Design an enzyme around this catalytic site. Structure first.
Site, mmCIF file in Angstrom:
data_model
loop_
_atom_site.group_PDB
_atom_site.id
_atom_site.type_symbol
_atom_site.label_atom_id
_atom_site.label_comp_id
_atom_site.label_asym_id
_atom_site.label_seq_id
_atom_site.Cartn_x
_atom_site.Cartn_y
_atom_site.Cartn_z
ATOM 1 N N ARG B 106 6.436 -9.622 7.192
ATOM 2 C CA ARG B 106 5.082 -9.185 7.377
ATOM 3 C C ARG B 106 4.623 -9.763 8.682
ATOM 4 O O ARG B 106 4.718 -10.974 8.875
ATOM 5 C CB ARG B 106 4.197 -9.697 6.250
ATOM 6 C CG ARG B 106 2.685 -9.581 6.536
ATOM 7 C CD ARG B 106 2.083 -9.410 5.206
ATOM 8 N NE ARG B 106 0.651 -9.287 5.322
ATOM 9 C CZ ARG B 106 -0.031 -8.360 4.637
ATOM 10 N NH1 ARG B 106 0.608 -7.496 3.836
ATOM 11 N NH2 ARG B 106 -1.370 -8.346 4.724
ATOM 12 N N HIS B 133 2.407 0.252 6.365
ATOM 13 C CA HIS B 133 2.152 -0.560 5.223
ATOM 14 C C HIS B 133 2.696 0.158 3.993
ATOM 15 O O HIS B 133 1.938 0.422 3.048
ATOM 16 C CB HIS B 133 0.678 -0.786 5.113
ATOM 17 C CG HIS B 133 0.411 -1.943 4.167
ATOM 18 N ND1 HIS B 133 1.205 -2.947 3.792
ATOM 19 C CD2 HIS B 133 -0.792 -2.161 3.533
ATOM 20 C CE1 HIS B 133 0.549 -3.734 2.988
ATOM 21 N NE2 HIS B 133 -0.641 -3.272 2.834
ATOM 22 N N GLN B 136 2.128 -1.045 -0.139
ATOM 23 C CA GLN B 136 0.777 -0.836 -0.572
ATOM 24 C C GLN B 136 0.742 0.511 -1.266
ATOM 25 O O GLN B 136 0.694 0.542 -2.487
ATOM 26 C CB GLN B 136 -0.171 -0.781 0.590
ATOM 27 C CG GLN B 136 -1.605 -0.569 0.170
ATOM 28 C CD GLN B 136 -2.102 -1.766 -0.585
ATOM 29 O OE1 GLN B 136 -2.015 -2.901 -0.085
ATOM 30 N NE2 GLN B 136 -2.579 -1.584 -1.798
ATOM 31 N N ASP B 231 -11.313 0.745 2.845
ATOM 32 C CA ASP B 231 -10.957 -0.611 3.191
ATOM 33 C C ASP B 231 -11.896 -1.131 4.270
ATOM 34 O O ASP B 231 -12.700 -0.363 4.801
ATOM 35 C CB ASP B 231 -9.559 -0.625 3.690
ATOM 36 C CG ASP B 231 -9.036 -2.029 3.962
ATOM 37 O OD1 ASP B 231 -9.516 -3.010 3.358
ATOM 38 O OD2 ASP B 231 -8.138 -2.144 4.789
ATOM 39 N N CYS B 262 -7.392 -1.593 -0.966
ATOM 40 C CA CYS B 262 -6.330 -2.596 -0.875
ATOM 41 C C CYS B 262 -7.146 -3.869 -0.691
ATOM 42 O O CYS B 262 -7.862 -3.914 0.283
ATOM 43 C CB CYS B 262 -5.465 -2.280 0.322
ATOM 44 S SG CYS B 262 -6.348 -2.144 1.858
ATOM 45 N N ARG B 308 0.622 -3.841 -7.076
ATOM 46 C CA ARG B 308 1.299 -4.320 -5.904
ATOM 47 C C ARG B 308 2.579 -5.020 -6.334
ATOM 48 O O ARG B 308 3.656 -4.776 -5.789
ATOM 49 C CB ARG B 308 0.347 -5.250 -5.194
ATOM 50 C CG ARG B 308 -0.156 -4.640 -3.891
ATOM 51 C CD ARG B 308 0.829 -5.379 -3.003
ATOM 52 N NE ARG B 308 1.247 -4.729 -1.782
ATOM 53 C CZ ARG B 308 1.001 -5.413 -0.667
ATOM 54 N NH1 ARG B 308 0.396 -6.595 -0.633
ATOM 55 N NH2 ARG B 308 1.422 -4.935 0.502
#
Lengths: 322, 322, 322
Positions: B106, B133, B136, B231, B262, B308
């Site tokens: 990451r 991503h 996710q 988000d 998220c 997740r």
């Protein structure tokens, strides 16, 4: 009442019979590890260890304890902005409980532990807040049993000298209340726990066969000390005369008094910071405990440190397993 | 095609049949942990988790997921100079693949993940780069299945509102393409996802039974939303009018619209930072989502957060086992 | 002779027969993990890894090695005030040994490792101090066996070029002494190891069939080298002419010469620090190793890196089990 899925946020949320049960569980598991036949009862559990402020010690006790029982640990150290800064305690908790089976929290106020407990529906263990320090005193009370086998807490005298108007002081109070200990907080008045908790705790203490006697008077408050307990001062001014040294140990009139300290301790004339103070403030041989008492036959300090692990393990087995 | 030892760097490297297979594996494993009969298929694996930039969440999903399956995790947090500063991506990867069985990365650009993948000889999972991503959206598409059982992704309408020229916007596009979702990015034009990806992704989307519609009108784009997604914004200027609030939810004309985010999210007028946003630019009740929608009977936010974990586990089981 | 419960603080605390035994254990365990029938001999042990200063690599070798054998690891990273600042080495050690079965220490002076060893009642492994780096040379001597099967270390020539007035130079010396290696430190005079250790370890080296030669002559030092070893310089001034490049490799007159480097290495004209140096100081093609040698068929650098794990595992199996 069943430790299962309970939190552990302060000692007074438990009865003396619950406390006694934790303490005995802590002792079976100690004997079992030492004997080689520990029954790992947490073999699939994932625990999260949030440490808003460091602690070499609590992390190690929580990691070794978990691991011996089969659980895996995710250490979340002081590195992310702390809980309340960018995300709600209510949201941190709620996400965490979706993944982990139990959460240890060490940090700031008791409000944060009490709110994490409220929203993460997993047990939340309190590794130390500003207000309370329950796991410590579990290690302590267990160290006390072991060094006075058979005597009940009811017939043991504990002296906690030095600054008590803090989570150590508060925690001694909750301990006495659930135990019936003749607990003497030997400290300048400015260094004594709050009025209400002392009011509450005495009543419970007495009711169980002890009483909380608050003195500034060394020999008198120490009179028949079974154990003398202290911790770091920084202050050196009002606290100086409270140093546990062999004179204090002698003033118990007790050939078998024992010494305890939740470490770290400033007893050397060595360590970077300790030494600085020995120089500045003249405190040579040590600050709150003298090195000759810390390394005495009487300090049970490292058994106390080992017992930190056996009791955190008890808290976790009691609340996550049946 | 079987994922065994494949890397997981972006969604479009997979076919919709591969995606569907991950998503079903995620749901067997969810059901199996919940039912207590999870077959740990990674019981000897050692996974390395490189996090060039933090994330409380991805770490926890990767640690709990790995541990449930028997693997041990080495978390490598933002602390060492980051990959490229003192040592070659080519060397970091090459050493790591000698010891670990899989590497999560990451951090920064997709170039770093694509190069670690190229030289590490093990699967590299993409925990988030600037460009993509993928993990996710696995949680997300699984959360969508669960909250519309039976409906195929072809027939669900997703609105992602707010800023979209970013890895969230790029990822929605790759999701629509492999899914056939009627996906509407309800963003100001300054914030639309880079043109070619929209060109590519919309033709694949359509080809699968959906279509990507880029708009600026809230009403128009939200029209018959199944799910509304947003988000964090920070900007507050062009983004303000895109706040998901109950009016947006209402403008779907659909009483069963559910909300996704998220996390972290700025919905309180508590959270120190957020509070300043509430004063400073006046977003009281919250910034990108209102607290009344975030704590709505309509939000599936914490199931999304739990998912997740079930999908990172699917990625790892799919690529390290058979 | 048994390594059981012994510490591992420097190579010269061991005989050549003990060293040879570690190295053979390292090779059984390598073969066993590669052939899938590793016998986990540490299945209940809890190891603590104190890293006062970072290292991506040592942490990973100690974590994978311990985990393959069944042990659980508590990584204590550079984050707490370091040992000696607020708490006595004597107290840190004493508390740790109550909980953990073995302690790795990486940090500062050998005095800290030697004191932790003295007071912790468990084995203390030295991950690197300013004075010594024993685990490294275990990986190295194992990488050398493997790349010259059958030749005894007695009949190998090692060149370590570059700066040696440091724990790598000290460690090469202790290696030659226990091995009988024709070891040539090809360094500027400013960068030669301290004299007394060279006096001691040459005499042991000779006594075992090798001899320690120290020169400033690349051509005379390299003359019939088997392996050429270097490490980072920063200095670029006196060290420049010592760069391992294919001319050095050629000056061995030995077509089978192989190259070793404890990583990280500056060989690219890519990595940010390596590029500053490449342009500012005109070292294109790399600093201490050229990229064309680092990526040569002669570099056994990543087998050396993998071997780091197989030997730390040997140290831990040797000292915690029987």
């Amino acid at each position: 009442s069943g430790f299962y899925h309970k939190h552990f946020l302060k000692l007074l949320d438990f009865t003396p019979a619950e406390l006694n049960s934790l303490l005995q569980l802590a002792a079976k598991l100690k004997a079992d590890k030492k004997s080689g036949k520990e029954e790992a009862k947490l073999t699939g559990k994932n625990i999260a260890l949030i440490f808003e402020k460091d602690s070499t010690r609590t992390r190690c006790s929580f990691e070794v304890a978990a691991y011996d029982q089969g659980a895996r640990v995710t250490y979340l150290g002081p590195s992310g902005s702390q809980i309340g800064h960018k995300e709600s305690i209510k949201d941190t908790a709620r996400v965490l409980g979706r993944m982990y089976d139990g959460i240890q929290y060490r940090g700031y106020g008791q409000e944060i532990v009490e709110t994490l407990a409220e929203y993460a529906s997993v047990p939340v263990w309190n590794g130390l807040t500003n207000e309370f320090h329950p796991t410590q005193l579990l290690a302590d009370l267990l160290t006390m049993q072991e060094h006075l086998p058979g005597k009940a807490f009811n017939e043991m005298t504990l002296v906690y000298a030095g600054d008590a108007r803090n989570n150590m002081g508060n925690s001694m109070l909750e301990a006495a209340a659930l135990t019936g200990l003749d607990l003497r907080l030997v400290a300048p008045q400015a260094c004594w726990p709050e009025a209400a908790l002392v009011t509450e705790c005495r009543a419970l203490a007495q009711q169980n066969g002890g009483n909380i006697t608050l003195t500034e008077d060394v020999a008198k408050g120490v009179e028949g000390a079974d154990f003398i307990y202290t911790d770091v001062w920084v202050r050196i001014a009002l606290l100086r005369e409270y140093q546990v040294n062999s004179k204090m140990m002698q003033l118990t009139g007790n050939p078998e008094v024992k010494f305890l300290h939740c470490l770290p301790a400033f007893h050397d004339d060595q360590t970077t910071l300790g030494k600085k103070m020995a120089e500045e403030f003249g405190l040579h041989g040590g600050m709150e405990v003298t090195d000759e008492v810390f390394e005495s036959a009487a300090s049970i300090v490292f058994d106390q440190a080992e017992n930190r692990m056996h009791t955190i393990k008890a808290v976790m087995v009691a609340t996550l397993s049946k």
